[PDB]
Amino acid sequence: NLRWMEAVLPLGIIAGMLCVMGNAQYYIHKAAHGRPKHIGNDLWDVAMERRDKKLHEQAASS
Amino acid sequence: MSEFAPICIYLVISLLVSLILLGLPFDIRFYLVSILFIIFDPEVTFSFPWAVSLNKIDPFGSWSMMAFLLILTIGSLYEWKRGALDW
Amino acid sequence: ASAVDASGNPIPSSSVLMASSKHIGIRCHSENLDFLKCKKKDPNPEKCLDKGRDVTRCVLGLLKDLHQKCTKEMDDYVGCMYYHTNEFDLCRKEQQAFEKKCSLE
Amino acid sequence: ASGWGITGNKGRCYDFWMDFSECMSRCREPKDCGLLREDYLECLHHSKEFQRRNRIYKEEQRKIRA
Amino acid sequence: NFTSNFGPAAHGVLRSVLEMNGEVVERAEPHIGLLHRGTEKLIEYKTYLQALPYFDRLDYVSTMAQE
Amino acid sequence: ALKEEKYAARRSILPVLQAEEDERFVREWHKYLAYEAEVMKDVPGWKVGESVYNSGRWVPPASGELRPDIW
Amino acid sequence: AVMEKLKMFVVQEPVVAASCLIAGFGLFLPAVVRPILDSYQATK
Amino acid sequence: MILSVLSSLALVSGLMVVRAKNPVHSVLFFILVFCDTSGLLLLLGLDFSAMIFLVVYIGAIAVLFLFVVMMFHIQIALWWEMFFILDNETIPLLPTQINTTSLIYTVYAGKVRSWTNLETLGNLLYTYYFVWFLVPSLILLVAMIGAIVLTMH
Amino acid sequence: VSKAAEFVISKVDDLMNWARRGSIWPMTFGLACCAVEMMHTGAARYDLDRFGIIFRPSPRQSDCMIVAGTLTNKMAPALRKVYDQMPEPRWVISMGSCANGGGYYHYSYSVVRGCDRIVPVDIYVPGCPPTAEALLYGLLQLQKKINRRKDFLHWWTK
Amino acid sequence: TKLEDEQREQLAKEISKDWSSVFERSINTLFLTEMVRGLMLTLKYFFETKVTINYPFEKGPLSPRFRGEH
Amino acid sequence: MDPIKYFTFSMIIFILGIRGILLNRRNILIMLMSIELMLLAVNSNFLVFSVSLDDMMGQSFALLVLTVAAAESAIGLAIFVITFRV
Amino acid sequence: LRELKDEGYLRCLPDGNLLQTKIHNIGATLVGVDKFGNKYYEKLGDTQYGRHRWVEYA
Amino acid sequence: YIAVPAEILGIILPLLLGVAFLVLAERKVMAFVQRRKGPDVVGSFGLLQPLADGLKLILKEPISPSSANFSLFRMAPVATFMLSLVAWAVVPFDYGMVLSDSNIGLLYLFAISSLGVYGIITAGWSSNSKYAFLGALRSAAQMVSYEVSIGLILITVLICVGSCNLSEIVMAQKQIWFGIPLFPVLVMFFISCLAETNRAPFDLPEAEAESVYSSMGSALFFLGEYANMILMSGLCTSLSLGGWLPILDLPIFKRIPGSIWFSIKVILFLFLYIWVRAAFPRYRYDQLMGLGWKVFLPLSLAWVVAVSGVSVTFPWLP
Ligand code: SF4
């Protein structure tokens, strides 16, 4: 007896989509910058990101 | 900022997809309700900053905001007894 | 996200700076604090350079001393700081390790 | 200017106003320290600073014709 | 007073016309000839046992009280 | 408690970053000052340093284009 | 008499009564509880 | 660039507000003026006031204007000054701003935390300057009882 | 004929016909007691929505018209005006026995002898009133009709 | 309409006898218990089986006294 | 240059609003919308000033004048809608 | 496998009804087969009154 | 540079798939409620029903309107569509799994709702007949009243937790779901979300429009309505039920990807929408606006006052 599962199933697809939806951009960004997104970047973290990037490029070039 | 750039790129991409989807097949009651909304909407506008900062303000903040709410609530009561929101 | 600079140079790399900030505060502190008093007197980037050079020397010395005593651990610790950009609440496990093998004080 | 800088710190151009005020209200001698008004208004508008930098570039450009 | 029309569930065929005022129905009036057949004329040009089905057809929800 | 942990870490790491950026600023300002002096030799000398803002209070340069530390 | 009038009004307008009671609770808590709590924290 | 775009849109849309007929067209161009002004404020770096311009200016006042002009649809009864302010030599010549572009001095000490403008504005407006906040309550109350006594028979 | 292209055309017609048959949207015209039985069809027993069928009221977005009942000389213009306002692909199902061929009151004034005179009926149905089974079988016959609707081929050969 | 004012008073003076009655009726109309009861009945029917005769494969019941194609 | 551009935009919008309220004399709707435009320009240059010279009271003033503008607009449109009943 | 899967099994995926009848079959028994080839089943029991005799059309 | 359009496409398309299957599941579950099956012929389980309906509405012979036939009639449906989606921009599906961390998200959502009101009113008036215009005015008034109620509810949930960006809110809930203590607040917010999109008991505007036009235009309009429905469900579960956080905090739940939790909560709320639709008759318009301006505004305001009070007397307020 699983007759109810015929109704959640279409709804269930939505779930999938939503999950997929989110995950998509996540992994996209994970490949576009090398690490996952960061929630709530105050100015401090942006300055730190710029400085770290410049420092690492200087170290790589040398 | 630097997030409203993703926002606006979303805006233009949504415009594009919507146009694509479009091209494929080829009185006093209202006025007073609007006024009451224009009056209670700055209420929400003012409640937004008051919401975030109820830790760097002692009961003085809560009381000032409650006095504002009381003035506008007497406004709402006068509105009610006049029956302008009767419909 | 390497923190070694292909040599002994500990390459500040702000992630590493925070990872040690859990720890720096008890080595150069007093020395460090004098710097701030300079900056309180006159925020003149000229007349407050000696103390800053001193603090940078002390901190780079700390990083050298601390990257050798804890190497593997520290590596993975910074390996879990670049990732999870700077959130301490994430992979606290590595932090735990960085207090067992590494220098606690 | 009052103190409340746009991000919760002593505003960029406060200290100058504080000195201006303490001198204008403490020693009421007539405009002996109107010298600080130029300073405070400069902080508000950088007028002297922009003028100086503009002139430096002006002369740099004038020596290019040679 | 507006003069609105109403020609609609499938709750039968009927034509209401409404003298209106704001949201008040000052005067509603139905037009009803929209489904006529001549049942009486037919019964006459018909019989008793042959005309029983006509009564069956009138008021087609309650289909036996008529007979 | 968590936010305070994070902010305390930032505070303790502040001075290294501050000193490094201060040294960078001194380097760039010395560059600009040498440039000025070089293009202001024969002009009637006016104290090449030229603290246009008198009464101390070093007052960083603060170029135009309001809110520069955002975009 | 006044109790009868109040019971009548509360039966008639339940949601306004509940709103007023919630607002009364939310205004009574600070005004009369904060001093007591500050005194308790002062004594312990 | 985009600053100039928003400014130009706002300018031309205000022109249409004043000149273009079919008053519903005027109200549309007015909404558009406010939208681009909100985007402009967003560019300035003040986000809260941008969203507020969206909510109360556009979503609240302009909808009232649209309502009223809807019910009465059938009721159809500088270059000199710009040069004078751009030839002052008190504005930095853009060539200067180039090299000095790499001259700003970050502090790294006033941004260990960061008050978003919403938070600091709340602080200031409610603790101090509070009577400045009680009076607008009275003017809103005046607005609503005025609407009532005027139109409500 | 480019036999490959004829196969692609056949598949395109199959897809088109399958969509048009599986998303059909009727439009009720409930004059007389058949409406009741039609409701019984749309009821829980012989469910209609199961076949992808939604009784859309507005005649600007419907596909079929189900004339269920009995026309009347007073009602013919309204029915014709409703029929005209539909999009191009249309079908008409004549329920009952007087919506098609006059039926009983066929022998009476003030009755149109069958809705065939006003709109070009597609498939009628028999009944008095048709058993809900009979109406559902009529709609399945309409599916079988719309299923032999090679259309893209006609445009490719026109 | 003078009587309606008088009737509405007694009807309120009758149900509002004690405090328990007014309190019960108030949180009754304030916590939507009849709404919840209707929702629970509906959800039961949802979980329950269906009718849905599935026509083209199992037709409906008839009787030898039927009428059809002559 | 950016303060110049912001302020000149605000000034030209103010000028446009006053020209609207002066030239057009009968259409009350255009009149009230021009008043709204004037208050909008005032608000915008208030904000630009609040951010140029680092000082906060500009934004408190901006919020309060927003309240004032909403009140005037509502009440004036009431005046109009009672004028156009006759 | 694939033989009967193509014969009368895989059509259910875009046909729908055949899936319901296959379920009723896994519950079913057999009672007849008619010259047109079609199979009549009867899943008599605790099922229901309306749906316990049906036919797969072959 | 090119990652951003990729993210935007990955946000847009799955939403359309999900909303098509949303209307499908809507029909199915209302059917099951009413003791009947839904669409079960076309697909294996009716899964190919929305695709078939879409193909039908595509091949259907179009009819261009005769009322401001450009730049005012062929734009407003696109306007409401763009508004719904740009609202969908900032919603957190997991830790950092967002599109934009707009640090004032709540104000953003509220503003976008008001702009949707603009969309519906201009789409109503852009037609020719006037009864559609009266219906548009009615819908606008209803929408804006329940928006002010939604605003006060947002102010409550905001008071409970300092910042505004939604990830911070879902952490605050990571302690304990705000739905638990403010359960009546959740009920009021849900009723206001119902009235905001005119779905379950408040339909008399649409019912009257059906009692008294382009195929693709109507399709776009219904698409906008149901997309706004999913959005309202999403923010309701993102600020009153946890937002990708396992229940009871036991390290067997922590194997579930977190994103699954958000989908489960939003699907539950969608099911509740459809369920409360098929159990209740509709209000009138009079009683509708009366409840909007008499029952939900005072209750919401009182709740703001009460929660502020309880959270300002004790040192419980961050
Ligand atoms: S037998 Fe025919 S004429 Fe009579 S009620 Fe039925 S559909 Fe109508």
Residue numbers in the entry:
A (entry chain A1): 2 to 63
B (entry chain 3M): 1 to 26, 57 to 117
C (entry chain A8): 2 to 106
D (entry chain S5): 2 to 67
E (entry chain S2): 10 to 17, 21 to 79
F (entry chain AM): 73 to 143
G (entry chain A3): 2 to 45
H (entry chain 6M): 1 to 77, 97 to 172
Sentences from the study reporting this entry:
Complex I (CI) is the main energy-conserving entry point for electrons into the mETC. CI oxidizes NADH and reduces coenzyme Q (CoQ, ubiquinone), pumping four H+ per two electrons from NADH. Across the studied eukaryotes, mitochondrial CI is composed of 14 highly conserved ‘core’ subunits that are responsible for electron transport and H+ pumping, and 30–35 ‘accessory’ subunits that are involved in CI’s assembly, stability and regulation.
Here, we present a cryoEM structure of an ~800 kDa assembly intermediate of plant mitochondrial CI from etiolated Vigna radiata (mung bean) hypocotyls at 3.9 Å resolution. This assembly intermediate, CI*, contains the intact peripheral arm (N- and Q-modules) as well as the PP-module and γCA domain, but lacks the PD-module. All the cofactors necessary for the transfer of electrons between NADH and CoQ are present in the CI* intermediate. The loops that cap the Q-tunnel at the interface of the peripheral and membrane arms of the complex, namely the NU3M TMH1-2 and NU1M TMH5-6 loops, are disordered. Core subunit NU2M in V. radiata CI* contains three N-terminal transmembrane helices that are present in yeast and bacterial complexes, but lost in the metazoan lineage. However, due to the lack of the N-terminal domain in V. radiata’s NDUS6, there is no interaction with NDUA9 nor traversing of the NDUA12 C-terminus. Additionally, we established that the γCA domain is membrane-targeted via two amphipathic helices that contact the CI membrane arm and through specific interactions with lipids in a lipid-filled pocket formed by core subunit NU2M, accessory subunits NDUX1, NDUC2 and plant-specific accessory subunit P2. Based on the fact that CI* is missing two of its four standard H+ pumps (those in the PD module), and on our finding that CI* shows NADH-DQ oxidoreduction activity, we hypothesize that CI* may be an NADH-CoQ oxidoreductase with a lower H+-pumping-to-electron-transfer ratio than full-length CI.
